[PDB]
């Protein structure tokens, strides 16, 4: 199926700096062509995607050893996250301990550029042994 | 709760998107009547977890405010979402707060609830928590991530719904977790206020005991002795005077202590505040949250 | 409702008349002023509370070196002696052996001025090693 260009999106786990909670937010998102998210929450101008070479090496380096989900027989983001770390802790991807503070990482609320404004802007942020 | 009936009347093609006057499906049927075997059997053949009314009310939304743990726990994994706003924006895990529900919380914030999303006049669950006196709750919530500085579109903090209330254990964990002590409101109202003028005097002792400022004064000059004395608390008035409170501070209405209490004929506060205040029709009301679901 | 007004009433232990059994009978009470019970029986006038100089000193005195219950869960006066006298002992207040007549000398019968005409009258009493 496809052949016919496709809505990538890209998001990624930041913290807000009204309350400094973990969430994810949309950075840039591909129709045959990207366009990145500025802080001030407009859309840049679409541009070619050009790759670095450690993310490229590094793409291949996960994907080699990477855990795949083929035909999955899910409708919601929570079924995906539950199959998708329980494949995880089967292949020794992740140990079940970590299994709680990922899924509600990844369950957590997926925010776009509109209520970019709302909050106090994002920042980087990385998930702790609790989830903070 | 007639499984077998439900099997039937669905292979005969009944439509389960099919709302009642209320708004709803008959997956929030099974969510508000517990039956867990019935919203199986519906999730598995095809039905929203997340359909709504006009009201906004998902089948989580019933589920949570009818305390149907079974009906959560099952409606979570297949996609009833724990980000779902109702009408007063309002989410499953702001009725899990207000009720004291920990289990469903714990299962709400698991999959990824949020403890700061807002209603629409900026009430949080750590909020309906703190204002209903729910220790265990707060603590929890106060450990996946909320803000107990965060305040509403008023200005009130956690600690000014407590003040309101007057649950000593709830100001405990948010003075343990850093809140701040003197936060304010809009108009300068800060918790000291709000518990002079409510009459709550554990916590007005609580808060004198962590470093609350006894003389602060709001935008129109009022201070937690005016708001004790307009409002008759005989008690609040002596156990500021003890802990610094000035008298003969005027406010910029032009009204001390002492006259508010002469002028609304409070014989005992009056009593109190003759002997401390030296010879020399504006009411002050802390803001409230008028949210209800 | 952190803080009612108080209703205070003193009783002391005193010996009857009649029978010559001791007991707690209320001497005078505080609603706002003080009221003292008579021999004959009726409330005489209420008056401001003068105090000794002495009975302030041994106040003091008995104050500093107190045991204060505070938040005490309990709600019978059987169990409120019970306490008390335990930690008494605790705090070497009293001695073990003095514990059985000061609980027999507690629940004595708690009368009131009504039982002054039915009663001959009373008189003080000390309690002596035994609840005599």
Same mark, same amino acid.
């Given at each position: 199926?496809?052949?016919?260009?496709?809505?990538?999106?890209?998001?990624?786990?930041?913290?807000?700096?009204?309350?400094?909670?973990?969430?994810?937010?949309?950075?840039?998102?591909?129709?045959?062509?990207?366009?990145?998210?500025?802080?001030?929450?407009?859309?840049?101008?679409?541009?070619?995607?050009?790759?670095?070479?450690?993310?490229? %090496?590094?793409? =291949?380096?996960? #994907?080699?050893?990477?855990?795949?989900?083929? +035909?999955?027989? /899910?409708?919601?983001? &929570?079924?995906?996250?539950?199959? %998708?770390?329980? =494949?995880?802790? #089967?292949?020794?991807?992740?140990?079940?301990? +970590?299994?709680? /503070?990922?899924?509600? &990482?990844?369950?957590?609320?997926?925010?776009?550029?509109?209520?970019?404004?709302?909050?106090?802007?994002?920042?980087?942020?990385?998930?702790?042994?609790?989830?903070? | 709760?007639?499984?077998?009936?439900?099997?039937?009347?669905?292979?005969?093609?009944?439509?389960?998107?099919?709302?009642?006057?209320?708004?709803?499906?008959?997956?929030?049927?099974?969510?508000?009547?517990?039956?867990?075997?019935?919203?199986?059997?519906?999730?598995?053949?095809?039905?929203?977890?997340?359909?709504?009314?006009?009201?906004?009310?998902?089948?989580?939304?019933?589920?949570?405010?009818?305390?149907?743990?079974?009906?959560?726990?099952?409606?979570?994994?297949?996609?009833?979402?724990?980000?779902?706003?109702?009408?007063?924006?309002?989410?499953?895990?702001?009725?899990?707060?207000?009720?004291?529900?920990?289990?469903?919380?714990?299962?709400?914030?698991?999959?990824?609830?949020?403890?700061?999303?807002?209603?629409?006049?900026?009430?949080?669950?750590?909020?309906?928590?703190?204002?209903?006196?729910?220790?265990?709750?707060?603590?929890?919530?106060?450990?996946?991530?909320?803000?107990?500085?965060?305040?509403?579109?008023?200005?009130?903090?956690?600690?000014?719904?407590?003040?309101?209330?007057?649950?000593?254990?709830?100001?405990?964990?948010?003075?343990?977790?850093?809140?701040?002590?003197?936060?304010?409101?809009?108009?300068?109202?800060?918790?000291?206020?709000?518990?002079?003028?409510?009459?709550?005097?554990?916590?007005?002792?609580?808060?004198?005991?962590?470093?609350?400022?006894?003389?602060?004064?709001?935008?129109?000059?009022?201070?937690?002795?005016?708001?004790?004395?307009?409002?008759?608390?005989?008690?609040?008035?002596?156990?500021?005077?003890?802990?610094?409170?000035?008298?003969?501070?005027?406010?910029?209405?032009?009204?001390?202590?002492?006259?508010?209490?002469?002028?609304?004929?409070?014989?005992?506060?009056?009593?109190?505040?003759?002997?401390?205040?030296?010879?020399?029709?504006?009411?002050?009301?802390?803001?409230?949250?008028?949210?209800?679901?």
């Amino acid at each position: 199926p496809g052949t016919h260009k496709v809505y990538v999106e890209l998001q990624e786990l930041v913290m807000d700096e009204k309350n400094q909670e973990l969430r994810w937010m949309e950075a840039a998102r591909w129709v045959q062509l990207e366009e990145n998210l500025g802080e001030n929450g407009a859309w840049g101008r679409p541009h070619l995607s050009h790759l670095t070479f450690w993310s490229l %090496l590094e793409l =291949r380096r996960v #994907f080699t050893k990477g855990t795949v989900l083929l +035909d999955l027989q /899910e409708t919601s983001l &929570a079924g995906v996250a539950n199959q %998708l770390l329980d =494949r995880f802790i #089967f292949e020794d991807q992740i140990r079940p301990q +970590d299994r709680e /503070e990922l899924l509600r &990482a990844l369950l957590l609320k997926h925010s776009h550029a509109g209520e970019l404004e709302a909050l106090g802007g994002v920042k980087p942020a990385v998930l702790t042994r609790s989830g903070d | 709760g007639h499984v077998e009936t439900v099997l039937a009347l669905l292979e005969k093609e009944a439509s389960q998107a099919c709302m009642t006057k209320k708004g709803f499906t008959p997956l929030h049927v099974a969510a508000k009547y517990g039956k867990v075997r019935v919203a199986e059997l519906l999730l598995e053949r095809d039905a929203h977890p997340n359909a709504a009314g006009k009201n906004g009310l998902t089948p989580l939304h019933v589920a949570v405010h009818h305390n149907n743990l079974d009906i959560v726990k099952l409606l979570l994994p297949r996609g009833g979402s724990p980000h779902s706003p109702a009408w007063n924006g309002y989410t499953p895990l702001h009725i899990a707060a207000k009720q004291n529900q920990v289990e469903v919380a714990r299962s709400l914030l698991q999959y990824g609830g949020s403890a700061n999303a807002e209603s629409v006049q900026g009430v949080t669950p750590l909020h309906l928590a703190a204002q209903e006196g729910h220790a265990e709750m707060v603590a929890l919530l106060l450990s996946k991530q909320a803000n107990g500085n965060l305040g509403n579109k008023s200005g009130l903090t956690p600690l000014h719904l407590v003040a309101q209330e007057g649950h000593v254990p709830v100001a405990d964990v948010l003075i343990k977790h850093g809140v701040m002590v003197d936060a304010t409101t809009r108009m300068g109202y800060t918790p000291l206020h709000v518990a002079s003028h409510y009459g709550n005097i554990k916590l007005v002792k609580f808060l004198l005991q962590h470093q609350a400022d006894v003389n602060a004064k709001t935008k129109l000059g009022y201070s937690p002795l005016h708001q004790a004395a307009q409002q008759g608390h005989t008690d609040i008035v002596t156990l500021l005077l003890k802990n610094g409170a000035s008298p003969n501070e005027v406010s910029s209405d032009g009204t001390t202590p002492l006259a508010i209490a002469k002028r609304l004929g409070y014989i005992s506060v009056t009593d109190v505040l003759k002997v401390v205040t030296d010879e020399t029709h504006r009411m002050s009301f802390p803001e409230t949250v008028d949210e209800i679901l």
